[PDB]
Amino acid sequence: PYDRKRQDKAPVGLKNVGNTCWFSAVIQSLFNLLEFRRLVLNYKPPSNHRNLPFMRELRYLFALLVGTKRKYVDPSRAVEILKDDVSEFTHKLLDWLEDAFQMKAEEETDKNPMVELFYGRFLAVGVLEGKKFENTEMFGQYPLQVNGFKDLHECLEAAMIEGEQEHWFTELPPVLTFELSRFEFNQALGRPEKIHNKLEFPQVLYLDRYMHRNREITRIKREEIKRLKDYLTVLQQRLERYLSYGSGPKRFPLVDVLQYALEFASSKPVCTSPVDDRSVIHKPFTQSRIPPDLPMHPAPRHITEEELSVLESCLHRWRTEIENDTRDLQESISRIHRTIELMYSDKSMIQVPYRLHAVLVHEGQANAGHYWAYIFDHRESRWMKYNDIAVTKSSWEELVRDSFGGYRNASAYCLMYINDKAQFLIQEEFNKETPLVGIETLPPDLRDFVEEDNQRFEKELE
Amino acid sequence: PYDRKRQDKAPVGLKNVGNTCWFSAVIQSLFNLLEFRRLVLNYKPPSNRNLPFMRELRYLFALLVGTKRKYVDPSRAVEILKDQQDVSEFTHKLLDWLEDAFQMKAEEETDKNPMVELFYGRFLAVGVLEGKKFENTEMFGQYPLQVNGFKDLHECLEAAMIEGEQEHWFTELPPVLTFELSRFEFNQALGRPEKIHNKLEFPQVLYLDRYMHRNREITRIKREEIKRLKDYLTVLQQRLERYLSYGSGPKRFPLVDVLQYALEFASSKPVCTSPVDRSVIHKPFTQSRIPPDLPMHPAPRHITEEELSVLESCLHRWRTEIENDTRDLQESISRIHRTIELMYSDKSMIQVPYRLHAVLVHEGQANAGHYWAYIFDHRESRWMKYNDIAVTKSSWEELVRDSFGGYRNASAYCLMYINDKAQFLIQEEFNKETGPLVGIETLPPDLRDFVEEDNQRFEKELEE
Amino acid sequence: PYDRKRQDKAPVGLKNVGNTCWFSAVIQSLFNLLEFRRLVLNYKPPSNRNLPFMRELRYLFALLVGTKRKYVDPSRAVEILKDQQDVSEFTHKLLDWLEDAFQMKAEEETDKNPMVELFYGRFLAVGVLEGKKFENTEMFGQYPLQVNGFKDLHECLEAAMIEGEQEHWFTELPPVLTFELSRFEFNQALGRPEKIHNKLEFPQVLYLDRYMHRNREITRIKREEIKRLKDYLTVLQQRLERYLSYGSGPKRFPLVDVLQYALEFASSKPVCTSPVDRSVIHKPFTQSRIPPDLPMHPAPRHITEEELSVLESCLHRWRTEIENDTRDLQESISRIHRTIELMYSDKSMIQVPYRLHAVLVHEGQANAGHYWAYIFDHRESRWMKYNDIAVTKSSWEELVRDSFGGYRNASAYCLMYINDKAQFLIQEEFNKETGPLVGIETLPPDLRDFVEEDNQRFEKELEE
Amino acid sequence: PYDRKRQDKAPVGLKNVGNTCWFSAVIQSLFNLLEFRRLVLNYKPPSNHRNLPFMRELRYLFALLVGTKRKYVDPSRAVEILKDDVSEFTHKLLDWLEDAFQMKAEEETDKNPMVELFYGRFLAVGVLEGKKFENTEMFGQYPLQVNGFKDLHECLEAAMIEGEQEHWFTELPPVLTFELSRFEFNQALGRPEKIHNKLEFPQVLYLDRYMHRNREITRIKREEIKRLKDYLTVLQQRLERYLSYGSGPKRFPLVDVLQYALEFASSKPVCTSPVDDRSVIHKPFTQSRIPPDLPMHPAPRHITEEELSVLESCLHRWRTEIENDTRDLQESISRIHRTIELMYSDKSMIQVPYRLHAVLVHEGQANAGHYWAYIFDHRESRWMKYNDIAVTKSSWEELVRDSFGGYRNASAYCLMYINDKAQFLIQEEFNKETPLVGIETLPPDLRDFVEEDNQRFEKELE
């Protein structure tokens, strides 16, 4: 009808019903992985228990979003089916999908596609009882705590050390889902609050450092940064001694105090006590309106001339010494920061790259708040903001604004990377008359469904 | 009837109906003036729009004087004033009706409304606009004032009467003096007229001896003085700032601090190489746990021991001089402030006191906001917050918390002072049998019967 | 001789020689204790390093008692203490010499130095380290204290005596009680031990009834209480902060403010199109110069009049509820604070007063800084700042300005209290002819002749 | 001797004697213009009065700086000669040079090179007496006041309007010297102080807008920005109404107050009165450690259910409306700023470009402070910091740090641009055996001087 149409070659919106905004985010992100909807659109329950109605509804939904000419579709049928908190709410959906696909596998020798896609394996090391510890687990979504961390690697390197037992990556799923937990108990409020420390994550993540293959050097490098950090702090402490220099409560840069004392000393002395009161052509390097150097009250009274040379010598040589000291300390600090940055930049460490595919963001109170998600359109190679009906050509800058941290009252609660060395997640199969060719990516039952809905919409337009 | 009765010997509240919060403030403030209530209750129109409103108002007054219910309703009377509706005009119409009605009560000689005597007076002018002299007297009911950039009410009044270098002068002042305080000033950063929230101090008792023509010469002799004094004072302030914010560059520091810091930097032990690197009973005056004297890193590399004495001498004597200069300038500035405060403190200038009777306060946007009032209970000698139903034994501290501004969203938009040299405004006259007001006995018999009928109906309403 | 004489009946200053600013503070503070001066001036070594220093010290005392010069020089005596030099030890050595010398004045029975009685006492312990009990008594001259994160001196003493969940208890206390206040704490941001500049309040009079073993049961019963009380109080504070800093996001605002602002936003008139675009005598209660009611731009586009009453009702009742909640919680918190203050206020706990006699204060780096002292003149009942030559009638306000900290670079490093239940520390004994100390007549004849010779020499020095 | 040698192909330092730092700055900048030292090194006083000794000393100095193997030379002989405040001190030097070259011209028909290089002509318009005003002047160094100005063009456009008479450029010297005056009377101090507002200037300056040729449109454009500015402010005022919205003294963003009120309303109601008190596998999109939604004290007590839908509808629709309003206002403001930026970007306005050659900077008190200067080495195309002896390979970033404004207690007091369409200022003449070839750029007397000094230095090295 009026502005309800879907623009050509544009993403389909999801209707929000009863605060279902979280469902739209997770569903639009999972649909966007091409491999996943090729995996679920080609799904018929084997004839050979509540997973099947929801699953069929989800499949019908996927076809509608994929093929409809409507700006947005309604997930209400599928949303109502998931009946049995938002965490466990998503958990039930995922559980249903993994077990429903579990049923589909037949014959062979007793793996499900989804556990391939979202799960892997990781190691362990001895606990503090004097006994070595070795174990492996599925670790589907890796949780992370954003307590005083600046980037994602600080977060991971802390979430994997867990006391001086360290985990290590053995098997990596093609899609890697990180959780970012902003909830920390606030004493000043006496309630668990979402901390608003900004956390940086990159568009592409090199996971080579956290896998066991290179383990030998990573700690052999980790230790080093520790040493380096135990060095770096020293400099900082020394440098602050130059920037915040003072006996008492108020501290000023030492160069400033030296310069100001020298200016006071060289100021014209005032023996008198306080509280006793056409166009001119210009030379190229002359200073106009230079104020007359009459005495002002702050200058010293006695001013021995012999001493003045002492004061100038002492203070200027010391000020130059201090300037060079500070510049050397800052150069050293900067180069240490540089080495720490790029010590993982060697070619052996850049072998495994995971590209960011989705970020799910949440605003408001913990129990109830708005949810939306940024995803990557690979064809146009553009970021897209999905928020219920609205799907917009967002940019990585609006992405960083909403998702990163203490910007504009928002936070990213989940990151979804995909491996770049395995492109089958985005690949589309040959149509054989030219690939995915849109609507013709679905089996005939969905085809007739979407065509009937589109003809109904054409009648509705009048 | 449950928790709706009036506690014994307590003021009564006014029901808030259709945003009557402003009307409750104005009415409670005017009623608590005892002379006014006595003027209103003793009022009969000569049988031979104001008359309906006025009878409803006198009935309201009798009710609120003698009721047993915790709050009465002005709905009947408030409905009578019919013409984001403007409240200033609405407030004006009640006044206008009242003193026109009291004006209608004239007999004998043509001249003498009681009201105009109570709330208006007259004041002088002068003329310098065309070099032509100007002398005029006007009526100045409720003198307006602007609070922009003013600390106390005296500053505000001086500015409100100078009005360009034509000065006004007080000649006749009513016993009830009403000052308007207008904070509405156009904010450029918003393109809208905002209520500026500068704190404005007013006293519990105001002496206007400076402002009447009787002492006009002296105030003019004295005002000029403070100007000179002020023009002098700023000089000191300027120089004092030089000591407190001393620096060539963008960051400025107290000069004594820079001297002490530099000196103790020179005193520190030179450090080379830059960046590269039971219970012990205590003596009565011993420092405990002092840090060692290891040469820290920020210190001069080479110090001539002979030149260090030069440095100590000069910096110590300079720091002492600066300390003495700053303390002298501060004593001088404090002295000037004290003289400016006490300038009008002499006996000749302390003879017309005006006690603060009420203040009317506002909270919110100009067009639509909340209103309440603070009124002095003279018998118990306590401030009382009148806000709709709620009548409370407030304190002058909560007064300044709401009235002054800069505190929450509260502002004081009107100040009603009463003169102290005539207490007939608060006199309750005398009843011979009691050996004074004796509360409810003041009202006439018609109001008396009314209040008793309401009281008996409330009795019936209580039982259940 | 020009402006170097002592004004009549005035204290004398001490010359600063080779950084003796600390020595002047300690010496003026100890001398002004009258009992101490009387003990020192009446001292003869038994003829039958401390003896030279001590005679020089008694000569210094006599000079400064009876001189006519504005300041005497401790250079002779200060030179005697020979061993960025440490001052804590330097201060210790003088004490040590003094009470060893006074210890040498024993006759008859083996036991009883006057000094140790004056500056030391004894205190209990308890033991929980190994589950094994511990009871011990030590001598605790000049009890040390740490000022880290403490508001008053009672907090400081409680912390300095709990020392882990082993608590100390006072059994014998000297009439002169010296507390050390150590601000030296390692600053991580600088890698250096810095003097933390938290303000620390101390009173002019200290009641230690809580700290002696006599009332140990009750303080233990009461301390636990405040803990509970404190543990309760924080709860309220937590909840109160929720009202004052209410927000899901990074920016938090008072909840009453958000409610009022949102309500008055809904009240505003809807504005469409977004971005695209004589003297008038005043009535007594009229708003003047109110801004017009033009619909400004930030306002809801479409408002259902029926739903606006819902909105007004809910937001007004919620704002009133929040106001009452906040005022109730604030009254409760204030109540708890008052009870914690008055907990020790009962008569049983107010019986051992200690008047603040002196405070020794420091300014600058730990190793090298400036020292001066504040000492009470009991006769004139006024605080007096003793700083080298300069002796001034300071006030307790300048005291708190220098001693408390957080003010300039000043810190208070030692507190010397004296007991009030025995005034023999300030008694001047009696002279029969005068019908008391009568100033200089206290000193013995040798010191007397000395002071008179100096005075006559000063007479000769004056003439010119 | 020890570290006094000059590195090969490196700039020569100037010795500081008696606070001559300003002299080093001005002299090193004037020497750097190639044309100028080709103009003064080829100078002999005509045999045919104090200008000549100083001039010869300056010429000998130039040869020494140009040819010496010493790290730095002493200008003391030349500095002492200028005897007769720093403004007038520079004025005397310039005056001496202009008149000394004035003498050199012979025959012809009664122009001096220096007045060509540093001076030009500008126009005027009627004063406020009802009478038209037309005039022209030499205007050597154009003064400028940096009172509340962000860039150099705001400064120039204000210094040329001078009341609603406007100046206009008729003749432009190849080198253009601007003065930046930071001195303004400070009432809080009662003394003239150097204001520390940062002022931006560009590496290249298009002067096409301030010349008379295009005058007709420049005002025709100036007026427009005025209109645009008189429009732009409106939006800003409107936008602040959204960002700082409040009755009283404390004002918060309106979106924040709406969101917070909605959260409070939807919070669980508390009828009770205040102050009355292995590793688990993770679902990919589940939120771990979500805090339990137990009541907290701030929630409302009565909560009519019917009204709650009212509150949600009202507040969320209003919050979305406000968000869209603010985004539209910000888009409009940004595009207006863009048009104002690039309205002078048309090709007709980019015809005249002046490249920055030097900036002279000063720190400290007005009467006496340190002076140094940044210049452009065109051969290496690198910025260089000249500060007495030290000549260093500075960068435009250290340039912006010291020179621009309220960074690190420094200010630029003079700008020296050179025209780019006239490169003869940097061109060097053909040596004819290969151009300037360094030392061989000077006449033989200077040649023998520098060679003798270099041999003396070689003897001195031992």
Numbering used by the authors:
A (entry chain B), D (entry chain B): 158 to 205, 216 to 251, 262 to 287, 292 to 345, 359 to 471, 515 to 671, 674 to 701
B (entry chain A), C (entry chain A): 158 to 205, 217 to 251, 260 to 287, 292 to 345, 359 to 470, 515 to 672, 674 to 702
Paper text:
The evolutionarily related deubiquitinating enzymes (DUBs) USP25 and USP28 comprise an identical overall domain architecture but are functionally non-redundant: USP28 stabilizes c-MYC and other nuclear proteins, and USP25 regulates inflammatory TRAF signaling. USP25 and USP28 share an identical domain structure and highly homologous catalytic domains. USP catalytic domains are usually around 350 amino acids (aa) in length; however, in USP25/28, the catalytic domains span ∼550 aa due to a large, conserved insertion of unknown function at a common insertion point between USP boxes 4 and 5 (Ye et al., 2009). Active enzymes form distinctively shaped dimers, with a dimerizing insertion spatially separating independently active catalytic domains.
Attempts to crystallize this intriguing USP25 tetramer eventually resulted in a 2.9-Å crystal structure. Interestingly, USP25 formed a dimer of dimers, wherein the distinctive, V-shaped dimerization interface of one dimer inserted between catalytic domains of a second dimer, forming a symmetric tetramer. Tetramerization orients catalytic domains such that ubiquitin-binding sites face outward and are accessible to solvent. Blocking loops 1 and 2, regulatory elements that line the C terminus of a bound ubiquitin (Clerici et al., 2014), are pried open by direct interactions with the insertion stalk provided by the second dimer. Importantly, we found that the tetramer was autoinhibited. A 14-residue section of the linker that is disordered in USP28 becomes ordered in USP25 and binds the ubiquitin binding site in a neighboring catalytic domain in the tetramer; this way all four catalytic domains are unable to bind ubiquitin. The AIM spans across the ubiquitin-binding site at the connection between the Palm and Fingers subdomains. Importantly, strong anchoring is provided by a section of the AIM, aa 519–524, that inserts itself into the core of the catalytic domain, occupying an unexpected pocket below the α5 helix. In particular, Pro521 and Phe522 rest deeply within the USP core, and this interaction acts as a wedge that pushes the α5 helix away from the catalytic domain, e.g., when compared to apo and Ub-PA-bound states of USP28. We conclude that USP25 forms an autoinhibited dimer of dimers, in which the insertion not only performs the key underlying dimerization role but also acts, via its AIM, as a regulatory element.
